[PDB]
Design a binder for this molecule. Sequence first.
Ligand SMILES: COc1ccc(S(=O)(=O)N2CCCCC2)cc1NC(=O)c1[nH]c(C)c2c1CCCCC2=O
Length: 127
Amino acid sequence: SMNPPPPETSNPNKPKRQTNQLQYLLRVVLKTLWKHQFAWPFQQPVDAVKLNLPDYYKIIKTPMDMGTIKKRLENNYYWNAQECIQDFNTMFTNCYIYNKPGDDIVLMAEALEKLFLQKINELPTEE
Ligand SMILES: COc1ccc(S(=O)(=O)N2CCCCC2)cc1NC(=O)c1[nH]c(C)c2c1CCCCC2=O
């Protein structure tokens, strides 16, 4: 019935780098989704205690949210752009696992995912 700890946003043992693709993911992809009309349900981990959703973390074992992704990018947690893209896709996948067609949260996820795909399809080349 408790929330899990949020996903780690730094691993002090991992090497760190900046790349044009990671810059794109933070400054173009995440930033565009973050200011979207439908961003607010996805800006932080699902708080299953405050929202009284005790089955959420019984169903969702790989939680992910844009707040975690944003912190991961700002902390240089990701070495490969693919790692971050996987996290965005996990976030959307979780929403479709837990919810149903026609749900408000699903219509919001679909709109955000459409925008995510438009931006990720312009990911710059590997410098
Ligand atoms: C009724 O839902 C809410 C009511 C109020 C607020 S809040 O922004 O006022 N605030 C959030 C931070 C803590 C204080 C309250 C947010 C929500 N929900 C969500 O954020 C959310 N986000 C997701 C991904 C999902 C959900 C819930 C629907 C099913 C599971 C799911 O998939």
